[PDB]
Amino acid sequence: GFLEAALERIEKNFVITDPRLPDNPIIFASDSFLQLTEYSREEILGRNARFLQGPETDRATVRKIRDAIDNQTEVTVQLINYTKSGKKFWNVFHLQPLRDQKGDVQYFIGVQLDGTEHFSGEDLEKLIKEAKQVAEEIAEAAKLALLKLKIKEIEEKIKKAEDNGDEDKVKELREKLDKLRKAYLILALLEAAKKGQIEEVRRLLELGADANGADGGGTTPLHLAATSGQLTIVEILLRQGADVNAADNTGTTPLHLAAYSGHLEIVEVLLKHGADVDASDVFGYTPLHLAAYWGHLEIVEVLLKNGADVNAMDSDGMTPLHLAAKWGYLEIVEVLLKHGADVNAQDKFGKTPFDLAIDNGNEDIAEVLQKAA
Numbered sequence: 001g002f003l004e005a006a007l008e009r010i011e012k013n014f015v016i017t018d019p020r021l022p023d024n025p026i027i028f029a030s031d032s033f034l035q036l037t038e039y040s041r042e043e044i045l046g047r048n049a050r051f052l053q054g055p056e057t058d059r060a061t062v063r064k065i066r067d068a069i070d071n072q073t074e075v076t077v078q079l080i081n082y083t084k085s086g087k088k089f090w091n092v093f094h095l096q097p098l099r100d101q102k103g104d105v106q107y108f109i110g111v112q113l114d115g116t117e118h119f120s121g122e123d124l125e126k127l128i129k130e131a132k133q134v135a136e137e138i139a140e141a142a143k144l145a146l147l148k149l150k151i152k153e154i155e156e157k158i159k160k161a162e163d164n165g166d167e168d169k170v171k172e173l174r175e176k177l178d179k180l181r182k183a184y185l186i187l188a189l190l191e192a193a194k195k196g197q198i199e200e201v202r203r204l205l206e207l208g209a210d211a212n213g214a215d216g217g218g219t220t221p222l223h224l225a226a227t228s229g230q231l232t233i234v235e236i237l238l239r240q241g242a243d244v245n246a247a248d249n250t251g252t253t254p255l256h257l258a259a260y261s262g263h264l265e266i267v268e269v270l271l272k273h274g275a276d277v278d279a280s281d282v283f284g285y286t287p288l289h290l291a292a293y294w295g296h297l298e299i300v301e302v303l304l305k306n307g308a309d310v311n312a313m314d315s316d317g318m319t320p321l322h323l324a325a326k327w328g329y330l331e332i333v334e335v336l337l338k339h340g341a342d343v344n345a346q347d348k349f350g351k352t353p354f355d356l357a358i359d360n361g362n363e364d365i366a367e368v369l370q371k372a373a
Contacts, residue, residue, distance in 0.1 A: 002152070014135075321341040
């Protein structure tokens with residue numbers, strides 16, 4: 001089983017359920033999960049996860065898990081579950097759907113992190129992110145295995161159509177096969193760009209991976225490389241025809257992500273390769289808005305040196321100076337004024353940068369802005 005081989009590799013606590021099958025049975029349980037819960041695969045596989053429920057499993061929490069399965073949504077909860085021998089354990093539990101190409105739910109992924117009862121605030125929030133990332137790691141391994149199964153199955157249908165001399169159906173299936181292969185290549189390239197696997201990026205491109213391929217949300221390899229600070233991978237993608245200005249479904253470009261993430265070298269390279277310095281996302285944010293919001297002084301300097309509109313307005317009428325004043329970035333306020341920033345700009349709620357400096361007790365910034373009035 002391609003899917004079985006892919007999931008046995010993951011040294012995490014998880015299950016996979018099939019909600020197409022009656023009562024949404026577990027069809028895969030990790031060694032780790034079986035270890036935790038004290039069951040064998042023979043005992044678990046083909047049964048509904050409700051054997052984990054005991055007297056002190058919160059029924060309102062189980063309800064939220066039931067609702068998430070009925071609405072085909074994600075949930076993360078904390079709750080007490082039970083081992084085979086009736087031992088209780090606290091766990092952070094994350095449930096998400098895994099969807100087919102049609103985007104219908106094919107499976108649910110459930111991830112457990114046990115021993116969580118003393119985690120609060122920031123530490124608990126790190127566990128909630130950890131369970132989600134594990135579910136994402138499982139979902140990508142499963143997507144790849146399911147693609148390989150589809151490829152195996154179309155190749156079987158091609159061999160059959162050849163043996164009946166159905167030459168039209170062979171051509172039709174060969175087009176489908178060529179698309180599954182393009183899909184596998186872009187899935188692998190997106191992941192390699194994100195993980196900073198330089199040689200793997202080179203090899204995927206040599207094998208015909210589309211430098212301009214995009215996921216669901218129109219995210220390109222270049223977007224991912226921008227976010228993760230992968231300078232070489234950025235250069236490789238650009239040399240091989242990656243659209244420097246590709247906008248995802250939120251109108252985010254690589255330059256936005258480079259500015260958002262503080263990656264100066266990448267901001268410089270994208271600009272040198274003709275990135276649109278004033279690209280606005282669906283919220284009307286430009287790279288300079290993001291650089292100012294996150295306090296990235298050197299990126300604010302490089303964007304203005306490259307002709308950034310110093311008075312761009314987001315859909316709330318905020319200019320870069322409003323954000324720098326709001327979040328207390330004195331040197332960015334100083335730099336923005338030297339480049340022509342409008343101290344009299346009013347956002348959608350009638351506030352100037354001076355007003356936001358005042359409301360946020362940013363004394364120094366209010367002085368400098370008053371002085372420029």
